[PDB]
Amino acid sequence: DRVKKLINSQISLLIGKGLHEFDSLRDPEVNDFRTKMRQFCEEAAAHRQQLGWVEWLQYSFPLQLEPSARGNRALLVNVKFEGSEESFTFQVSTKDMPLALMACALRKKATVFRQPLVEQPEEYALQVNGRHEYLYGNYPLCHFQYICSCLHSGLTPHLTMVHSSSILAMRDEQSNPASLWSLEQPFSIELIEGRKVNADERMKLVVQAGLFHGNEMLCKTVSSSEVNVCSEPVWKQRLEFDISVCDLPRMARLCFALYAVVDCPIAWANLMLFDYKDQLKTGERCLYMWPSVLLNPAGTVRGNPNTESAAALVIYLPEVAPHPVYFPALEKILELGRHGERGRITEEEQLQLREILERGELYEHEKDLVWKMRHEVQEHFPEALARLLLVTKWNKHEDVAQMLYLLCSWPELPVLSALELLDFSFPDCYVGSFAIKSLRKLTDDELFQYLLQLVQVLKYESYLDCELTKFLLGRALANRKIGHFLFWHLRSEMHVPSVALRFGLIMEAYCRGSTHHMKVLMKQGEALSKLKALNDFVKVSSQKTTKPQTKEMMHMCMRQETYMEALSHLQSPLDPSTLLEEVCVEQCTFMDSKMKPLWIMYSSEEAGSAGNVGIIFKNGDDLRQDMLTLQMIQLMDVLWKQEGLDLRMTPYGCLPTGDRTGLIEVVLHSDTIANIQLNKSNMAATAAFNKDALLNWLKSKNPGEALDRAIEEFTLSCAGYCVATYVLGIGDRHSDNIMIRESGQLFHIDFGHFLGNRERVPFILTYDFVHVIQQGKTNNSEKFERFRGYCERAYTILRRHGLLFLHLFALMRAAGLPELSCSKDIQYLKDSLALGKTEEEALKHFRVKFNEALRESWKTKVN
Numbered sequence: 089d090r091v092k093k094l095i096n097s098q099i100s101l102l103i104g105k106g107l108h109e110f111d112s113l114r115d116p117e118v119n120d121f122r123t124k125m126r127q128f129c130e131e132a133a134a135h136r137q138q139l140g141w142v143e144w145l146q147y148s149f150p151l152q153l154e155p156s157a158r159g160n161r162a163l164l165v166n167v168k169f170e171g172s173e174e175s176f177t178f179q180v181s182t183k184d185m186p187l188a189l190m191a192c193a194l195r196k197k198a199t200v201f202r203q204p205l206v207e208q209p210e211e212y213a214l215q216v217n218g219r220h221e222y223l224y225g226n227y228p229l230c231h232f233q234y235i236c237s238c239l240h241s242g243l244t245p246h247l248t249m250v251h252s253s254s255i256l257a258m259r260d261e262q263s264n265p266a267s268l269w270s271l272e273q274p275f276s277i278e279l280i281e282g283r284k285v286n287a288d289e290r291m292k293l294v295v296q297a298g299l300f301h302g303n304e305m306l307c308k309t310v311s312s313s314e315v316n317v318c319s320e321p322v323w324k325q326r327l328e329f330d331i332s333v334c335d336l337p338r339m340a341r342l343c344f345a346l347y348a349v350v351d352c353p354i355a356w357a358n359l360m361l362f363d364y365k366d367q368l369k370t371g372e373r374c375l376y377m378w379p380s381v382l383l384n385p386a387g388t389v390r391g392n393p394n395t396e397s398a399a400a401l402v403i404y405l406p407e408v409a410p411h412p413v414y415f416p417a418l419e420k421i422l423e424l425g426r427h428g429e430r431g432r433i434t435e436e437e438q439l440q441l442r443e444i445l446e447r448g449e450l451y452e453h454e455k456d457l458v459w460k461m462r463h464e465v466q467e468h469f470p471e472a473l474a475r476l477l478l479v480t481k482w483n484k485h486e487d488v489a490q491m492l493y494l495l496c497s498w499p500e501l502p503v504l505s506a507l508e509l510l511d512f513s514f515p516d517c518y519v520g521s522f523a524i525k526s527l528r529k530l531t532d533d534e535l536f537q538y539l540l541q542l543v544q545v546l547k548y549e550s551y552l553d554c555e556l557t558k559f560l561l562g563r564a565l566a567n568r569k570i571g572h573f574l575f576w577h578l579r580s581e582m583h584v585p586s587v588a589l590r591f592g593l594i595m596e597a598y599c600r601g602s603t604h605h606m607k608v609l610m611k612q613g614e615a616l617s618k619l620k621a622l623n624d625f626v627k628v629s630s631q632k633t634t635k636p637q638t639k640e641m642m643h644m645c646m647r648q649e650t651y652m653e654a655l656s657h658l659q660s661p662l663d664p665s666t667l668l669e670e671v672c673v674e675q676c677t678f679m680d681s682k683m684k685p686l687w688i689m690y691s692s693e694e695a696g697s698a699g700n701v702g703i704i705f706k707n708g709d710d711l712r713q714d715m716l717t718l719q720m721i722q723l724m725d726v727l728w729k730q731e732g733l734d735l736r737m738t739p740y741g742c743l744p745t746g747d748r749t750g751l752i753e754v755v756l757h758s759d760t761i762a763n764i765q766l767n768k769s770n771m772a773a774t775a776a777f778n779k780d781a782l783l784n785w786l787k788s789k790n791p792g793e794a795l796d797r798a799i800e801e802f803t804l805s806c807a808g809y810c811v812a813t814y815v816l817g818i819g820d821r822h823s824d825n826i827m828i829r830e831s832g833q834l835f836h837i838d839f840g841h842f843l844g845n846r847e848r849v850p851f852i853l854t855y856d857f858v859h860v861i862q863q864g865k866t867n868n869s870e871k872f873e874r875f876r877g878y879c880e881r882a883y884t885i886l887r888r889h890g891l892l893f894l895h896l897f898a899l900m901r902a903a904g905l906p907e908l909s910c911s912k913d914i915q916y917l918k919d920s921l922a923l924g925k926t927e928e929e930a931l932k933h934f935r936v937k938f939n940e941a942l943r944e945s946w947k948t949k950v951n
């Protein structure tokens with residue numbers, strides 16, 4: 089049928105790779121994933137097309153709640169009905185529920201239309217005007233992110249009563265069309281030859297090989313003999329590893345490194361000793377090696393796709409038996425692990441276990457005590473599983489059976505513990521499956537908060553079909569917002585040839601699950617395609633002609649029918665809730681920096697003031713570190729909000745969408761501190777002293793009694809960013825990367841440097857901001873000390889959740905960020921959060937650091 093061919097060409101267009109390239113690989117593991125995941129994703133599609141209307145609202149328009157609500161006061165609301173142009177303004181309470189507001193809107197409509205109404209508030213849902221956002225459920229109004237937002241900014245909520253029949257019509261329009269353990273032989277392989285090798289002919293070539301189970305070496309690394317450097321080196325030898333074949337763990341990977349000697353790395357390549365169907369690998373293997381920067385165990389176990397250039401390493405995995413040798417089944421493993429011995433011991437050794445499991449590296453004798461007491465670890469300290477898995481001898485199949493027997497009876501762990509187990513230092517498939525089992529209780533909101541880390545964890549995976557891929561795909565097919573961001577996180581990495589196969593295969597599986605959503609994502613990629621061409625034209629044009637003429641050239645290019653069709657009426661890749669309707673070509677522009685980023689403005693007749701939104705298209709710079717930094721700041725704001733602390737933060741969206749390409753959400757009514765401190769003449773803010781400019785600017789935007797609230801929004805946000813930048817190690821802070829909103833809210837932009845990357849970043853305190861906190865006064869210790877308390881109270885909330893940040897940053901090592909790769913980078917966080925110390929000692933240390941920042945600020949007050 090021409091529908092399947094059309095869908096296939098559309099999927100190929102969307103994921104940035106033709107589906108024909110997957111079939112051309114003639115790979116059983118690739119094709120068996122494509123069938124298995126297509127079946128799974130079409131099941132989800134059918135389940136979804138039969139959902140109730142409230143469950144389809146939960147799929148498409150998941151609730152956006154205030155972090156305090158998860159797990160009185162007068163309010164003016166405007167409610168219109170779908171199709172109608174007349175609306176009703178009424179004053180309800182922040183503690184009233186949506187159903188009461190719907191009953192009140194149906195009463196006003198029944199009185200206005202002089203008819204006794206049959207419809208009931210149970211048949212309706214409230215849409216945020218011109219938005220893919222809905223208010224529903226038994227939650228008071230103030231609990232919704234939209235109503236709470238309106239309260240802070242003084243604006244009036246505009247809602248539309250959508251009927252159950254119109255909601256079902258959306259659902260209907262959006263339809264998809266119709267034995268190893270008895271082999272004590274030492275492990276060995278044949279190093280046959282090497283092809284396309286480029287190196288200095290003065291030197292010699294060596295091949296180093298190690299056996300890994302995640303990070304720990306299964307045995308000592310072995311090396312080949314030094315051979316003369318050439319394009320075709322030949323060893324023809326047998327390297328022998330000090331490990332039995334029966335003792336090979338299921339997740340064992342043979343890691344190779346090709347290099348030149350007289351240190352000079354040329355290439356690296358890894359492979360799994362067992363295939364995806366559990367069969368031990370035998371035969372001739374060609375390893376298309378990856379360039380080097382010596383063994384790389386964390387690197388992928390798949391060949392370099394560029395075979396017309398990559399250096400090859402031809403090896404032979406010897407046939408250990410006259411029959412196919414598979415990895416033993418769980419029943420065979422549990423039966424062997426069921427016959428161990430429980431460690432009965434005195435309170436003296438029990439005192440050490442109760443201390444070293446709560447208290448971090450271990451001593452050799454301490455590991456002997458953790459393994460001996462493994463049964464007591466399971467029963468009394470179930471959250472110490474990660475310590476026990478690290479003391480388990482993975483190079484001993486009998487010790488792996490003893491561990492797996494305890495794991496299979498181990499109780500489900502809390503999300504914080506499960507997040508730790510996803511780390512690469514726990515590569516066992518059963519340990520990953522148990523960790524996924526304990527993540528299933530994650531709400532859509534927690535899942536969305538750690539989605540970026542879970543996507544990086546896919547890079548650590550050894551096989552295509554994994555529990556994490558199925559978990560992520562299942563949650564994405566059940567929630568259109570998870571699906572949206574899962575698509576973009578994978579799509580942004582298609583240019584990386586090591587993840588392109590897996591990421592493109594998951595994106596195809598998702599696309600089968602939702603034909604409609606793929607067409608919405610295509611519309612987004614179409615706009616990004618024109619933004620790329622539009623940015624290029626601006627880069628070339630701006631270097632020859634002036635800024636006003638290049639901006640008019642940009643507006644002419646934008647006014648072409650192709651650009652008007654592509655750039656308008658789309659969901660925002662930065663927020664599916666936000667509809668980018670009419671491009672306001674007049675207000676679009678670009679910045680004066682080397683990459684000339686585009687500022688695209690949008691408006692909406694339906695959404696009103698909410699519809700006037702902006703996006704920034706950036707091409708040339710990498711946005712991955714900004715996205716992570718902003719996500720961590722967002723996390724801080726959630727944690728602070730859950731303890732009743734609202735520091736008025738501004739975690740705007742940042743979305744990488746391709747190769748050095750991405751979008752940033754524009755924060756309207758905001759300016760940089762540098763622009764405000766330029767002190768232009770004939771402005772409502774022209775100062776006598778430059779220190780007054782920032783405060784005068786606030787006075788113009790916030791007249792009379794509004795200034796009091798504006799100074800308080802500034803102060804709260806200052807305390808939030810001071811702590812955030814100190815904890816995260818953000819440096820390169822200057823007037824042009826600190827912005828302020830007309831409301832008084834301060835915030836940071838340009839997050840290219842973090843984790844002190846490498847000098848320890850001190851606590852920063854600017855006298856220009858201290859002058860605002862002090863309300864213009866020289867001495868105002870009441871206001872300044874209120875601010876020190878906001879810092880202290882925000883810092884101690886973050887320390888309480890310090891393990892969550894550490895576990896998230898550890899998973900993020902997989903992203904390959906230059907300022908995030910080794911223990912040294914994440915050491916910065918342990919220092920900033922002072923996690924080794926007590927709450928009194930860390931607070932004393934934070935006070936000394938804040939005081940040392942105040943003395944530096946007084947070098948400006950002395951002037």
Ligand SMILES: COc1ncc(C2=CCOCC2)cc1NS(=O)(=O)c1ccccc1
Nearest residue numbers: 679685704740752753754755760837838839
């Ligand atoms: C890292 O680059 C950025 N990061 C954030 C923003 C934002 C701005 C205003 O709205 C919230 C986001 C903008 C940029 N990039 S830019 O070149 O457009 C820019 C730089 C400095 C001042 C204003 C604009």
